[PDB]
Amino acid sequence: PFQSTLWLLVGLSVHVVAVMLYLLDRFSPTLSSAMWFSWGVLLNSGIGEGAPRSFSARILGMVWAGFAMIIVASYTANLAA
């Protein structure tokens, strides 16, 4: 259902936000920790113990989960279609 153009952006869209989350939480009253946090959500694997202590990452993490859920649900419909 999804062409290779989509998979070109999937591998970078998840990665680009990883450094951003490390940027927001650190400079408020690392890279490896955030990398396992975002990718694990997409694959639904409980990897790593890193947690969004800062409130900014939590609200961004909240909407981020919804981005993964639509991908899985929609793709299942296409295959069944």
């Binding site: 927001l24 409130f55 900014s56 609200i59």
Partner: peptide, 15 residues
């Protein structure tokens, strides 16, 4: 829409 969500709230946390 969520990209700038943290940027707006980032300033508000300082004060």
């Amino acid at each position: 829409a969520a990209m700038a969500l943290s940027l707006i709230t980032f300033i508000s946390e300082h004060l």
